[PDB]
From Swiss-Prot, chains A, B:
It comes from the Eukaryota. The chain holds residues 32 to 80 of 80 of the full protein. This is Defensin-like protein CAL1. Expressed preferentially in root exodermis and xylem parenchyma cells in vasculature of root and flag leaf sheath. It comes from Oryza sativa subsp. japonica (Rice). Belongs to the DEFL family. Plant defensin-like protein involved in accumulation of cadmium (Cd) in rice leaves. Mediates Cd efflux from cytosol into extracellular spaces via chelation. This drives Cd secretion from xylem parenchyma cells into the xylem vessels, hence lowering Cd levels in cytosol meanwhile promoting Cd translocation from roots to shoots. Rice varieties with high CAL1 activity over-accumulate cadmium (Cd) in rice straws, but are not affected by Cd accumulation, or the accumulation of other essential metals in rice grains. These functional characteristics could be used to breed dual-function rice varieties that produce safe grains while remediating paddy soils. The keyword Secreted applies.
Length: 54, 54
């Protein structure tokens, strides 16, 4: 399929606590004007990262 | 940050091998049309992430 856009991530400003639903993260990120978002782990911390085209 | 610009990260397309020096990562990222870059660890990988204002 078509050559896709490159994506950029930024940790959520609003999301609270452990990120264990990427759908919930994506919706919180929509309140921050990003179209998408996903949970990511670093060590034992799971955080919400908002996602847009760079 | 909070009273500054919000920044976005995108894993480098061109950077090869383990990211040791964030200066080297930033320079490779400049060839990718990002103004900055930095090494970040996840799992047993240290990778170069290009960095711009969202």
């Amino acid at each position: 399929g078509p050559l896709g856009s490159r994506h950029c991530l930024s940790q959520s400003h609003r999301f609270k606590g452990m990120c264990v639903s990427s759908n919930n993260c994506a919706n919180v990120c929509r309140t921050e004007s990003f179209p998408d978002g996903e949970c990511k782990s670093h060590g034992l911390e799971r955080k919400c990262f908002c996602k847009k085209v760079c």
